[PDB]
Amino acid sequence: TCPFYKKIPGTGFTVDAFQYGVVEGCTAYFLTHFHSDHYAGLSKHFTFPVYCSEITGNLLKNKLHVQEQYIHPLPLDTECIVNGVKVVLLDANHCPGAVMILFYLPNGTVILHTGDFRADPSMERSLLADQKVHMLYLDTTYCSPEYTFPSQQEVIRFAINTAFEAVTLNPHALVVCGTYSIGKEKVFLAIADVLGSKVGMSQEKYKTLQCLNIPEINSLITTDMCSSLVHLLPMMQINFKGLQSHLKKCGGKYNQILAFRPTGWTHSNKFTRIADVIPQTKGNISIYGIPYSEHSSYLEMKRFVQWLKPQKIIPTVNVGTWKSRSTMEKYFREWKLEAGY
Numbered sequence: 001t002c003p004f005y006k007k008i009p010g011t012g013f014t015v016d017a018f019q020y021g022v023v024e025g026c027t028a029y030f031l032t033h034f035h036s037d038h039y040a041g042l043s044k045h046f047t048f049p050v051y052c053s054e055i056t057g058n059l060l061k062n063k064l065h066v067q068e069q070y071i072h073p074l075p076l077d078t079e080c081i082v083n084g085v086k087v088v089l090l091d092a093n094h095c096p097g098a099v100m101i102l103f104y105l106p107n108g109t110v111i112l113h114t115g116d117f118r119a120d121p122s123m124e125r126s127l128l129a130d131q132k133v134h135m136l137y138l139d140t141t142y143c144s145p146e147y148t149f150p151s152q153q154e155v156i157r158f159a160i161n162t163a164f165e166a167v168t169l170n171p172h173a174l175v176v177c178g179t180y181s182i183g184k185e186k187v188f189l190a191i192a193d194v195l196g197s198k199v200g201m202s203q204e205k206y207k208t209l210q211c212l213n214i215p216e217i218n219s220l221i222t223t224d225m226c227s228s229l230v231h232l233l234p235m236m237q238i239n240f241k242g243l244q245s246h247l248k249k250c251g252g253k254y255n256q257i258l259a260f261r262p263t264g265w266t267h268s269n270k271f272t273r274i275a276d277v278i279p280q281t282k283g284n285i286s287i288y289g290i291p292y293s294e295h296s297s298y299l300e301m302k303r304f305v306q307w308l309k310p311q312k313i314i315p316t317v318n319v320g321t322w323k324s325r326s327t328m329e330k331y332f333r334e335w336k337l338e339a340g341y
């Protein structure tokens with residue numbers, strides 16, 4: 001049965017609530033983004049209205065085979081009416097097609113549901129600034145002070161420089177990037193752009209990218225592995241054994257691999273700046289762990305919330321345990337006392 005934190009009170013709306021079968025009273029199902037924990041339950045068998053971004057709708061039609069009649073795409077930064085209620089979709093700074101949803105309730109309450117997001121100061125100059133928001137449904141993935149990470153730009157600059165040096169030293173080196181879902185495309189697109197290459201991948205991954213409305217995408221990607229010096233592989237294959245196996249498949253055209261594993265936070269964020277990163281190496285294979293995050297850091301989340309000044313916060317991540325809920329409640333109260341709301 002559907003949790004309270006996926007329901008928007010005083011509407012017939014739900015958000016990311018597809019795994020409970022038919023939700024009693026729901027007239028419109030919103031989907032924030034195309035990550036499987038959020039879409040769980042959606043398939044060609046679904047027959048109720050789904051509201052989402054154009055990119056999310058592309059993926060629902062082509063990958064999950066949801067019938068077109070049930071897909072209702074909405075543009076971004078535009079006031080729209082759904083079932084007699086004013087809504088706005090805003091860029092979440094997460095993966096492609098990911099949104100936050102602003103609900104203007106008939107009684108005058110305003111609710112922001114972040115979906116998954118990486119808070120940014122540019123959000124403080126969006127439509128959110130135009131009126132008071134009363135309730136916030138928050139992506140609390142990294143709601144603890146230990147969670148720091150570098151900017152996306154710092155990480156990309158390190159990746160571009162590392163790959164350019166390795167391939168300039170050895171023109172027979174292949175670059176590999178691991179992936180398991182949409183998101184983090186800039187890692188492999190920026191590396192391929194500095195090397196003057198397309199990115200090579202499986203037919204199933206190419207199909208996914210072709211749904212993302214990336215300008216000039218046909219000049220950037222290919223299914224011809226041979227012709228390209230940056231390859232994508234499942235994240236599970238980015239280890240010494242898998243990368244050796246892959247090198248054997250490529251018909252000797254390469255004699256070395258440099259690989260990237262974009263992760264979330266992992267314990268060592270605590271000590272190491274991006275400039276100090278060194279790879280794990282076994283023979284002619286080197287692997288770099290790079291902390292490229294599409295969720296808010298603690299400091300990013302705290303800045304956004306203290307600017308928004310909500311009257312109530314409803315967490316959407318790490319809500320299954322007491323301990324976790326209690327810890328998050330302590331931080332929200334600190335933030336409120338500090339900023340005076």
Ligand code: NI
Binds near residue numbers: 035
């Ligand atoms: Ni996500």
